[PDB]
């Protein structure tokens, strides 16, 4: 049993439940996988797409581009002398992916609360799981400050952006789960 793998399995399950709630709440807003384009915020910032691979799959090492964002932050998920750099870079990039998403999700939630009704709001449990996993991934975890606005934003745009992020995040959550399973075995 791997504790980070348990957190990652909790993350994928939490996103799956939130995604189901989002489809039910926003009946008109189009939130089916077919009608929602895949857009990834972390497209160029992080190297999870390349660094997070089984050791057998990655060989030439040429594609790792000049140790891109090679922070290699030390953390409680692995041990400093336990695994190869290929997994050390991957764990740092996964931490960065969760930081980029959590900062955005909190911004969306703060705008959603202002709605006169409560049609939809991001799951507090899902946000807590993202923070818990980041704390294990990197010791120098930064907790996002409470975000708020002094004005009211258009709600339709936030609800379309929300659906686009949730689906992309779910794909990211499976990718983290596969890496955690590989680390355990």
């Amino acid at each position: 049993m791997f504790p980070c793998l348990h957190h990652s399995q909790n993350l994928l399950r939490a996103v799956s439940n939130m995604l189901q709630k989002a489809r039910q709440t926003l009946e008109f807003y189009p939130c089916t996988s077919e009608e929602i384009d895949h857009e990834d915020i972390t497209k160029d910032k992080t190297s999870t797409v390349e660094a997070c691979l089984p050791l057998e799959l990655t060989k030439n090492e040429s594609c790792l581009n000049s140790r891109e964002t090679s922070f290699i932050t030390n953390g409680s998920c692995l041990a400093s002398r336990k695994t190869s750099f290929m997994m050390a870079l991957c764990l740092s990039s996964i931490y960065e992916d969760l930081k980029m998403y959590q900062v955005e999700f909190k911004t969306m939630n703060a705008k959603l609360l202002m709605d006169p009704k409560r049609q939809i709001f991001l799951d507090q449990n899902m946000l807590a799981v993202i923070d818990e996993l980041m704390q294990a991934l990197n010791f120098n975890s930064e907790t996002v400050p409470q975000k708020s606005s002094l004005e009211e934003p258009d709600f339709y745009k936030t609800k379309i952006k929300l659906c686009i992020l949730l689906h992309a995040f779910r794909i990211r959550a499976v990718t983290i789960d596969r890496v955690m399973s590989y680390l355990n075995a």
Binding site: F28, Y29, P30, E35, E39, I41, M114, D115, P116, K117, E152, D154, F155, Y156, K157, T158, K159, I160, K161, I164, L165
Partner: protein, 291 residues
């Protein structure tokens, strides 16, 4: 930057928030680079409210003037229908029709017990279909005020964490509640309360029944409550039928020589205390004591 609307942008005049009765100019505009891949005089640019068609223009610029919108939110989504391909949602607007906020007619502040947190309650009035922010301010004789905001859209009450210790039992403290929404702002009339009015004594927690240490009818009741009580009241009513309860008891924690019925049949007992006779609320009756 995830972009919600890529094919085109839709504008609303004057704004998404409008006063009940106003008319909005929802206008759907398509960027020149985006559009139907094959020009044909069959493709349309529909506008839908709750998925109900309101307008259709072949040209990229579509103009609509919806009227008589009811209180609430209406989703106007502007989709593109091409010749054979299915409709692609392009962009949409959510409109919240609202009205000016109701002023709170009555404001009351109650503190529970000698040691308590002051809590103020107000009548919100009609619900404006808009986000509502409530501010409760308490000012003493000196112009120093505690500021607390109830950001929650519906607030039963707002509680000041700090306990109020009155420099003198007769002081004047004034409380006001302000409600602010995108459309307007309503403030309750200032209400001045003396400390005795705000404080409400706790119901006496303790109760003991003794028949004057004897089989005699006379009964002595040993209860305990908050120290600063200058008055009290006791229920001597027979349990089977309520009769009369004494208006006032002496300033004794322990009742002595109370007139009680000679039988030993079970009798319910209730007790209340008044912090100040001149301007203090009566305490709630204590849990009934059987026999």
């Amino acid at each position: 930057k995830i972009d919600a609307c890529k094919r085109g942008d839709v504008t609303v005049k004057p704004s998404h928030v409008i006063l009940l009765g106003s008319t909005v100019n929802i206008t759907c505009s398509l960027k020149p680079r985006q559009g139907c891949f094959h020009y044909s005089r069959r493709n349309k640019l529909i506008l839908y409210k709750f998925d109900r068609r309101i307008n259709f223009h072949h040209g990229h610029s579509l103009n609509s003037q919806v009227t008589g919108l009811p209180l609430g939110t209406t989703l106007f989504v502007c989709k593109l229908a091409c010749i054979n391909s299915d409709e692609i949602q392009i962009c949409g607007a959510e409109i919240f029709v609202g009205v000016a906020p109701e002023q709170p007619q009555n404001l009351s502040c109650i503190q529970k017990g000698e040691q308590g947190t002051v809590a103020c309650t107000w009548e919100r009035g009609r619900d404006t279909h808009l986000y509502t922010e409530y501010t409760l301010q308490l000012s003493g004789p000196k112009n120093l005020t505690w500021q607390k905001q109830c950001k929650d859209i519906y607030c039963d009450y707002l509680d000041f964490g700090i306990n109020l210790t009155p420099e003198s039992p007769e002081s004047n403290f004034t409380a006001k509640v302000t409600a602010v929404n995108s459309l307007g702002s309503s403030s309750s009339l200032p209400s001045t309360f003396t400390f005795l009015d705000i404080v409400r004594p706790l119901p006496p927690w303790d109760i003991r029944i003794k028949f004057q240490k004897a089989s005699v009818s006379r009964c002595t009741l040993y209860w305990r409550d908050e120290g600063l009580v200058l008055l009290n009241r006791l229920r001597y009513r027979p349990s089977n039928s309520r009769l009369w309860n004494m208006v006032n008891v002496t300033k004794a924690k322990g009742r002595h020589d109370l007139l009680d019925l000679k039988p030993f049949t079970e009798y319910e007992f209730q007790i209340s205390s008044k912090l100040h006779l001149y301007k203090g609320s009566w305490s709630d009756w204590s849990e009934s004591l059987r026999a």
